[PDB]
Design an enzyme around this catalytic site. Structure first.
Site, PDB file in Angstrom:
ATOM      1  N   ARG A  57       0.819  -1.218   0.000  1.00  0.00           N
ATOM      2  CA  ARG A  57       0.000   0.000   0.000  1.00  0.00           C
ATOM      3  C   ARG A  57       0.862   1.282   0.000  1.00  0.00           C
ATOM      4  O   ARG A  57       1.879   1.397  -0.769  1.00  0.00           O
ATOM      5  CB  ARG A  57      -0.974  -0.101   1.199  1.00  0.00           C
ATOM      6  N   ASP A 115      -2.721  12.359   9.555  1.00  0.00           N
ATOM      7  CA  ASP A 115      -4.095  12.065   9.158  1.00  0.00           C
ATOM      8  C   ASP A 115      -4.832  13.389   9.072  1.00  0.00           C
ATOM      9  O   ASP A 115      -4.908  14.168  10.050  1.00  0.00           O
ATOM     10  CB  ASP A 115      -4.738  11.110  10.160  1.00  0.00           C
ATOM     11  N   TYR A 134      -6.542   5.473  18.333  1.00  0.00           N
ATOM     12  CA  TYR A 134      -5.922   5.788  17.031  1.00  0.00           C
ATOM     13  C   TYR A 134      -5.753   7.322  16.890  1.00  0.00           C
ATOM     14  O   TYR A 134      -4.677   7.831  16.535  1.00  0.00           O
ATOM     15  CB  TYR A 134      -6.749   5.194  15.826  1.00  0.00           C
TER      16      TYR A 134
HETATM   17  N1  LIG Z   1      -5.373   4.734   4.070  1.00  0.00           N
HETATM   18  C1  LIG Z   1      -5.867   5.935   4.422  1.00  0.00           C
HETATM   19  O1  LIG Z   1      -6.896   6.404   3.932  1.00  0.00           O
HETATM   20  C2  LIG Z   1      -5.164   6.815   5.438  1.00  0.00           C
HETATM   21  C3  LIG Z   1      -5.833   7.949   5.915  1.00  0.00           C
HETATM   22  C4  LIG Z   1      -5.172   8.759   6.831  1.00  0.00           C
HETATM   23  C5  LIG Z   1      -3.872   8.480   7.183  1.00  0.00           C
HETATM   24  N2  LIG Z   1      -3.226   7.381   6.686  1.00  0.00           N
HETATM   25  C6  LIG Z   1      -1.881   7.079   7.132  1.00  0.00           C
HETATM   26  O2  LIG Z   1      -1.004   6.729   6.100  1.00  0.00           O
HETATM   27  C7  LIG Z   1      -0.112   5.709   6.499  1.00  0.00           C
HETATM   28  C8  LIG Z   1      -0.260   4.525   5.514  1.00  0.00           C
HETATM   29  O3  LIG Z   1      -1.621   4.120   5.418  1.00  0.00           O
HETATM   30  P1  LIG Z   1      -2.053   2.653   4.891  1.00  0.00           P
HETATM   31  O4  LIG Z   1      -3.540   2.698   4.706  1.00  0.00           O
HETATM   32  O5  LIG Z   1      -1.107   2.330   3.781  1.00  0.00           O
HETATM   33  O6  LIG Z   1      -1.648   1.829   6.207  1.00  0.00           O
HETATM   34  P2  LIG Z   1      -2.066   0.344   6.714  1.00  0.00           P
HETATM   35  O7  LIG Z   1      -2.319  -0.472   5.462  1.00  0.00           O
HETATM   36  O8  LIG Z   1      -3.196   0.394   7.716  1.00  0.00           O
HETATM   37  O9  LIG Z   1      -0.801  -0.147   7.493  1.00  0.00           O
HETATM   38  C9  LIG Z   1       0.505   0.233   7.139  1.00  0.00           C
HETATM   39  C10 LIG Z   1       1.464  -0.806   7.672  1.00  0.00           C
HETATM   40  O10 LIG Z   1       1.645  -0.603   9.085  1.00  0.00           O
HETATM   41  C11 LIG Z   1       2.317  -1.724   9.528  1.00  0.00           C
HETATM   42  N3  LIG Z   1       1.990  -2.047  10.909  1.00  0.00           N
HETATM   43  C12 LIG Z   1       0.734  -2.241  11.377  1.00  0.00           C
HETATM   44  N4  LIG Z   1       0.757  -2.626  12.652  1.00  0.00           N
HETATM   45  C13 LIG Z   1       2.061  -2.764  12.953  1.00  0.00           C
HETATM   46  C14 LIG Z   1       2.801  -3.165  14.133  1.00  0.00           C
HETATM   47  N5  LIG Z   1       2.136  -3.531  15.246  1.00  0.00           N
HETATM   48  N6  LIG Z   1       4.146  -3.124  14.074  1.00  0.00           N
HETATM   49  C15 LIG Z   1       4.822  -2.775  12.977  1.00  0.00           C
HETATM   50  N7  LIG Z   1       4.242  -2.397  11.834  1.00  0.00           N
HETATM   51  C16 LIG Z   1       2.879  -2.385  11.798  1.00  0.00           C
HETATM   52  C17 LIG Z   1       1.783  -2.943   8.709  1.00  0.00           C
HETATM   53  O11 LIG Z   1       2.840  -3.831   8.361  1.00  0.00           O
HETATM   54  P3  LIG Z   1       2.643  -5.400   7.904  1.00  0.00           P
HETATM   55  O12 LIG Z   1       1.615  -5.392   6.838  1.00  0.00           O
HETATM   56  O13 LIG Z   1       4.026  -5.810   7.428  1.00  0.00           O
HETATM   57  O14 LIG Z   1       2.192  -6.185   9.130  1.00  0.00           O
HETATM   58  C18 LIG Z   1       1.060  -2.284   7.543  1.00  0.00           C
HETATM   59  O15 LIG Z   1       1.450  -2.844   6.295  1.00  0.00           O
HETATM   60  C19 LIG Z   1      -0.485   5.334   7.926  1.00  0.00           C
HETATM   61  O16 LIG Z   1       0.458   5.945   8.847  1.00  0.00           O
HETATM   62  C20 LIG Z   1      -1.891   5.866   8.049  1.00  0.00           C
HETATM   63  O17 LIG Z   1      -2.313   6.116   9.386  1.00  0.00           O
HETATM   64  C21 LIG Z   1      -3.869   6.544   5.844  1.00  0.00           C
HETATM   65  N1  LIG Z   2      -2.949   2.732   9.368  1.00  0.00           N
HETATM   66  C1  LIG Z   2      -4.082   3.232   8.890  1.00  0.00           C
HETATM   67  N2  LIG Z   2      -4.863   2.526   8.052  1.00  0.00           N
HETATM   68  C2  LIG Z   2      -6.030   3.030   7.549  1.00  0.00           C
HETATM   69  N3  LIG Z   2      -6.668   2.178   6.725  1.00  0.00           N
HETATM   70  C3  LIG Z   2      -6.053   0.803   6.396  1.00  0.00           C
HETATM   71  C4  LIG Z   2      -7.214   0.084   5.763  1.00  0.00           C
HETATM   72  C5  LIG Z   2      -8.055   1.152   5.073  1.00  0.00           C
HETATM   73  C6  LIG Z   2      -7.830   2.412   5.889  1.00  0.00           C
HETATM   74  C7  LIG Z   2      -6.416   4.296   7.892  1.00  0.00           C
HETATM   75  C8  LIG Z   2      -7.442   5.165   7.656  1.00  0.00           C
HETATM   76  C9  LIG Z   2      -8.661   5.022   6.880  1.00  0.00           C
HETATM   77  C10 LIG Z   2      -9.454   4.946   6.385  1.00  0.00           C
HETATM   78  C11 LIG Z   2     -10.647   4.829   5.638  1.00  0.00           C
HETATM   79  C12 LIG Z   2     -11.676   5.702   5.955  1.00  0.00           C
HETATM   80  C13 LIG Z   2     -12.888   5.627   5.274  1.00  0.00           C
HETATM   81  C14 LIG Z   2     -13.086   4.652   4.304  1.00  0.00           C
HETATM   82  C15 LIG Z   2     -12.064   3.742   4.021  1.00  0.00           C
HETATM   83  C16 LIG Z   2     -10.842   3.819   4.704  1.00  0.00           C
HETATM   84  C17 LIG Z   2      -7.279   6.301   8.322  1.00  0.00           C
HETATM   85  N4  LIG Z   2      -6.086   6.210   8.949  1.00  0.00           N
HETATM   86  C18 LIG Z   2      -5.564   5.005   8.710  1.00  0.00           C
HETATM   87  N5  LIG Z   2      -4.459   4.474   9.221  1.00  0.00           N
END
Ligand SMILES: NC(=O)c1ccc[n+]([C@@H]2O[C@H](COP(=O)([O-])OP(=O)(O)OC[C@H]3O[C@@H](n4cnc5c(N)ncnc54)[C@H](OP(=O)(O)O)[C@@H]3O)[C@@H](O)[C@H]2O)c1
Ligand SMILES: Nc1nc(N2CCCC2)c2c(C#Cc3ccccc3)c[nH]c2n1
Ligand SMILES: NC(=O)c1ccc[n+]([C@@H]2O[C@H](COP(=O)([O-])OP(=O)(O)OC[C@H]3O[C@@H](n4cnc5c(N)ncnc54)[C@H](OP(=O)(O)O)[C@@H]3O)[C@@H](O)[C@H]2O)c1
Ligand SMILES: NC(=O)c1ccc[n+]([C@@H]2O[C@H](COP(=O)([O-])OP(=O)(O)OC[C@H]3O[C@@H](n4cnc5c(N)ncnc54)[C@H](OP(=O)(O)O)[C@@H]3O)[C@@H](O)[C@H]2O)c1
Ligand SMILES: NC(=O)c1ccc[n+]([C@@H]2O[C@H](COP(=O)([O-])OP(=O)(O)OC[C@H]3O[C@@H](n4cnc5c(N)ncnc54)[C@H](OP(=O)(O)O)[C@@H]3O)[C@@H](O)[C@H]2O)c1
Ligand SMILES: Nc1nc(N2CCCC2)c2c(C#Cc3ccccc3)c[nH]c2n1
Ligand SMILES: Nc1nc(N2CCCC2)c2c(C#Cc3ccccc3)c[nH]c2n1
Ligand SMILES: Nc1nc(N2CCCC2)c2c(C#Cc3ccccc3)c[nH]c2n1
Lengths: 251, 251, 252, 249
Positions: free
Chosen positions: C13, C145, C158
């Site tokens: 991702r 975030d 979180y």
């Molecule tokens: N996706 C969104 O819409 C969104 C929105 C706001 C902010 N963000 C921020 O953007 C960043 C990336 O988002 P994402 O959606 O790509 O993240 P994600 O898929 O939820 O997780 C990112 C990675 O964090 C690692 N992680 C989780 N728990 C862990 C632990 N206990 N120890 C060590 N590593 C761990 C995992 O590694 P493994 O898979 O190797 O276990 C996972 O692949 C995050 O910091 C997130 O909060 C994302």
């Molecule tokens: N590490 C981590 N993971 C996130 N996600 C991992 C799975 C999808 C979203 C989010 C996340 C989100 C989201 C989301 C909100 C609405 C609909 C779908 C995903 C916000 N901060 C996050 N931080």
């Protein structure tokens, strides 16, 4: 065909740095100016030397008045007239001086210049930009990283910049369905006047965590260029501080 | 001698509630109004019935113009001429309507009204109040809890409220040496009009976390009362949201 | 000689997009991972196939514990072991799940994972990064975030974690500025909704975003990281760039 | 029947002043303390001498650990045990010391600074909500959280986290009629033992009166937020800083 940008207050300092950078990245530019006619034409000269028919100047007072909407519309019109399009608007022009609350320009003039240049003209230029519209359309507003720790006795200036933050957000929200992104760049201290006492410059320089120096004009322009680029296609309503950490330093 | 207060836009709704509550707390009040003359006079009558010679009215348009500085000076003067003092200023008057960026008042009139009422008049009233001064002097500005998530097509209104935040902070800083505190109250949704649609009111009510209802005018006035009180003597430059959690609710 | 970057949670991702772009820009990369072992190893393989020994993997749980400080020190150490230097740290790894205040992980475990991954490990990585330190351009980027001030219902820990991270971004920018280390954040709104979420639901979120009624791509997030680590951001520190399509501006 | 409040770190300084003021307002109070046993018992005695059976002490360490949730549940439990109800929670207890990036282990620093300032407030908030009329919580934040002291990163991360808790909990507990707000002091009640030159240095920075807040001034804002005059206020944080946060470098 090359895209076109309007940069307000572009005859010198930060605004010229922005104009130059867009031009170098391939933009044709409207160099707006108020009083600095010789500097504006001179820059349009350099840039046209570099590439013919890629710069024009455009004179406008951006003080608030009942004709300001016309003046702003004419700035945008001037980009279309010269280039057939207008892709980017950078709202840089700004009045800056103290307006003490407790005791000479009249207060009416002070309101007109400080709120006009920093906020209302940006709003009017934004309306006109949108109205006249593959593309990467955006607006960048020059804000101020210190708006929440304001200079003593700069109330009107500070209200103007706060209003500009509000415009940045409102316009981002409203103009997103037209594909127009709207962002800001918030300098801390940048480009100290030569005139200013060397000991006063050092006093301020010494406050900046990152390198104890003010930002170069180039450093501000770099952030503008990022926000206009395809590297920022999802970014809208963001304001990027370019302050060397100054806003983080307590009294 | 009872302290005295000016409340702008005090004939109706939230301003009226603020005037009543201050008068209940022991203040003499100037009821400023623009068009609501019968309501302003009726309020004055009711307040003077409770306590003789404790309420007066002052009419003024607070639209931005060449005469606004004098009008604001007039308003502060009305408080000195009636009561011999002016301890509190509450900047409540506010124009509010949409000003879409993409196209019936002219735009410059929209600018004058929305930016005048929400920002410039509060700045001029603040200057006039300060210039005229164990007192407990303070200013309370009616802000907006939703200023960072603004309603679509309300650019100028939002700019005006952002400027007002800027004024609150700037004036708190600058007037602190004179013992004048400057603070804000930021309502969410309060006192929805009776004639607004039932579908739309229900829509907005349901969004408020705390009770699924709008604020009463008295609940907004309660925060004003606190800020002017002796319980807020160290508080300046602070903006208190009174929004039931609405600003915390994501889209 | 090429600079080097550590990217946490870089197997999949957004972290993966960040590691890939950094590598494409000329960096050597430490791909940190926790459970996604195959994804991390195949990524390092793809990168080393492009340029020899420009990628290494490093496994570590970043849950708060007695051993987290040493784990974080070993992540930074692995970058020095592989590449002789560590120029960039991207704190991307993050646990994300609800922790309702009112009613089978225990709450103390939820505290450790959510505050550990989002805040504490970044702090410890930042300490180790700084302790180990004119063409130098050192910097840290924390993944924040954009919705922190309008949080998801029931996600208190979180949200606390991400707020702490903003605090760290500011505090560390102030404190590390004298060493030439910049510290910034990128704040996504909705990005790369999980493949297994139904499209009809993806569209309900997508529809809220002003700019195009869609979520950000992983590469769009990565682009902001690349900017912040570039020479074009040399005076930028303590700044958090939203990459949210205007989502945080939309009222309830 | 009088309402009851829990005030953490209430044996002395700002927490004591908050307890005193809530008690003067008509609340029964749990004075939580960690090390200041003598001060806590002396306060409880004084408040009960004023009105019988209206104060108790409760001892707990609020350092993070695997038993912290039980310790927080027990604090809330101690308010119900003594008074039969728990209407107000004030999260005031706070560790504060520098933790530079470049005797205490770092594990211990993390546990104390993040535990006291953020995790315990969260667990106390859970326990308060679970155990449930003008119900509210007030978290003691910091008006300087965005212009933080040098080398105070973990303290600062804690107080940022506490802001996030204030918002998340205000949002989530609002349907239960429980309001959650913050009071953010600037410089307040400087240690009598602190150097006079240094005190004067910080005092002169404050726009409003060139003085620090009194503990009573901080308490006054807590009193407002728990009062019937704040019944539509949730998720708000009131700075009580004399304008200090407005002053540029
Ligand atoms: N996706 C969104 O819409 C969104 C929105 C706001 C902010 N963000 C921020 O953007 C960043 C990336 O988002 P994402 O959606 O790509 O993240 P994600 O898929 O939820 O997780 C990112 C990675 O964090 C690692 N992680 C989780 N728990 C862990 C632990 N206990 N120890 C060590 N590593 C761990 C995992 O590694 P493994 O898979 O190797 O276990 C996972 O692949 C995050 O910091 C997130 O909060 C994302
Ligand atoms: N590490 C981590 N993971 C996130 N996600 C991992 C799975 C999808 C979203 C989010 C996340 C989100 C989201 C989301 C909100 C609405 C609909 C779908 C995903 C916000 N901060 C996050 N931080
Ligand atoms: N310099 C800093 O440290 C700093 C700090 C914070 C924010 N910023 C922001 O960055 C931007 C550029 O800063 P700067 O120092 O380069 O600006 P500046 O030198 O103070 O002024 C920029 C230009 O604004 C134009 N301007 C002034 N009054 C005008 C009017 N009534 N009508 C039309 N144009 C007018 C002037 O044009 P003419 O010369 O053609 O008359 C001037 O060249 C500004 O928006 C500023 O507020 C700068
Ligand atoms: N209601 C809400 O939900 C809400 C939400 C956020 C913030 N607020 C803020 O709280 C305050 C009170 O709200 P409200 O709903 O009571 O306001 P309102 O009813 O919209 O307007 C208040 C008064 O403003 C005065 N006013 C309008 N235009 C004027 C002008 N050109 N010159 C002088 N006065 C003028 C009017 O006086 P006349 O009647 O005498 O003509 C009007 O009665 C405002 O500052 C508002 O922006 C309200
Ligand atoms: N003073 C200021 O200028 C200032 C500025 C900004 C914010 N604040 C905030 O206002 C609140 C009160 O400030 P203050 O100066 O009165 O606080 P303080 O004297 O630093 O500490 C308050 C109490 O916290 C308790 N505490 C510390 N560590 C603990 C632990 N591990 N477990 C349990 N309790 C613990 C202590 O209890 P025992 O004494 O019983 O051990 C202490 O009495 C704090 O939340 C603070 O962050 C104060
Ligand atoms: N249009 C405009 N111009 C500014 N300046 C033009 C003269 C030097 C600063 C500033 C400015 C500044 C400054 C400054 C601060 C400390 C020491 C010296 C200059 C802040 N916002 C500005 N906006
Ligand atoms: N001067 C003034 N007046 C307002 N209103 C007057 C008519 C009702 C709202 C608002 C107002 C509002 C509102 C509202 C928002 C959502 C649903 C219903 C009303 C926000 N700021 C305002 N300022
Ligand atoms: N729990 C806790 N305690 C604090 N202090 C306890 C004694 C000194 C201040 C502070 C504190 C402070 C301070 C201060 C500022 C300027 C000069 C001296 C102290 C800020 N947040 C705090 N949190």
């Amino acid at each position: 065909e090359a895209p076109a940008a309007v940069v307000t207050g572009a005859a010198k300092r930060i605004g010229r740095a922005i104009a130059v950078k867009l031009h170098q990245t391939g933009y044709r530019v409207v160099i707006h100016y108020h009083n600095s006619a010789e500097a504006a034409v001179s820059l349009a000269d350099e840039l046209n030397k570099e590439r013919s028919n890629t710069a024009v100047v455009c004179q406008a007072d951006l003080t608030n008045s009942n004709v300001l909407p016309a003046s702003c519309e004419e700035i945008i019109n001037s980009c279309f007239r010269a280039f057939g399009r207008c892709d980017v608007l950078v709202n840089n022009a700004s009045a800056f001086y103290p307006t003490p609350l407790v005791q000479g320009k009249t207060v009416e003039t002070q309101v007109a210049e400080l709120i006009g240049t920093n906020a209302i003209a940006p709003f009017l230029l934004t309306m006109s930009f949108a109205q006249r519209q593959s593309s990467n359309l955006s607006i960048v507003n020059l804000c101020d990283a210190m708006v929440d720790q304001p200079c003593m006795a700069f109330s009107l200036y500070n209200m103007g910049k706060h209003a500009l933050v509000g415009l940045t957000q409102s316009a981002a929200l409203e103009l997103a369905p037209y594909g127009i992104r709207v962002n800001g760049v918030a300098p801390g201290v940048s480009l100290l006047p030569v005139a200013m006492g060397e000991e006063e410059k050092d006093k301020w320089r010494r406050k900046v965590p990152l390198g104890r120096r003010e930002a170069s004009a180039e450093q501000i322009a770099d952030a503008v260029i990022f926000l206009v680029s395809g590297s920022a296609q999802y970014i809208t309503g963001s304001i990027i501080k370019v302050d060397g950490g100054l806003s983080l330093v307590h009294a």
